[PDB]
Design a protein around this ligand. Structure first.
Ligand SMILES: Nc1ncnc2[nH]c3cc(F)ccc3c12
Length: 167
């Protein structure tokens, strides 16, 4: 048993809810919150900008030190950093950004990072401002992640659309 509440069960291991991941993180304080990162860990907008804002920019300060030491991530890759005031850990995962011209096949590789963690609170990778089809992102998630994932969908109208179209 875990502390996630009000989720719609999609499969054995995938759950979904219409919620802001920042508000869910603050309430649950999960072991792992996933950030929809870019390779530079520059948290300007979307999930990244909102989580970073909720950490009072501490996420960005930590991220800049990580990049100065290690260089950029790969598209499809990830790193584990602090969850600050939101979670124990933040798993920064880079899905492909369609609005930059990256290969959507890399979305499966991005979701594979979730399998290194038994339970995660996570967003739909590559959706929203990343430019991919969210119905597709949900399908790849269900077909790739084997650990227990609690998906927070921010957009109310998109949430209704994802549930009603789910196979
Ligand atoms: N794309 C998302 N998925 C789940 N939760 C979210 N909270 C947000 C807050 C923002 F300002 C922007 C995007 C999200 C978001």
């Amino acid at each position: 048993v875990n502390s996630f509440s009000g989720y719609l069960k999609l499969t054995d291991n995938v759950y979904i809810k219409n919620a802001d991941i920042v508000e869910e993180a603050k309430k649950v304080k999960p072991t792992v919150v996933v950030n929809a990162a870019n390779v530079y860990l520059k948290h300007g907008g979307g999930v990244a900008g909102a989580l970073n804002k909720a950490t009072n920019n501490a996420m960005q300060v930590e991220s800049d030190d990580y990049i100065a030491t290690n260089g950029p991530l790969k598209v499809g890759g990830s790193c584990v950093l602090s969850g600050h005031n939101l979670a124990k850990h933040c798993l920064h995962v880079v899905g492909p950004n369609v609005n930059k011209g990256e290969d959507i096949q890399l979305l499966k590789s991005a979701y594979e990072n979730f399998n290194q963690h038994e339970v995660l609170l996570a967003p739909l990778l590559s959706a929203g401002i990343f430019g991919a089809d969210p119905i597709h992102s949900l399908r790849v998630c269900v077909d790739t992640v084997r650990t227990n994932v609690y998906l927070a969908v921010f957009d109310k109208n998109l949430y209704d659309k994802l549930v009603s179209s789910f196979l």
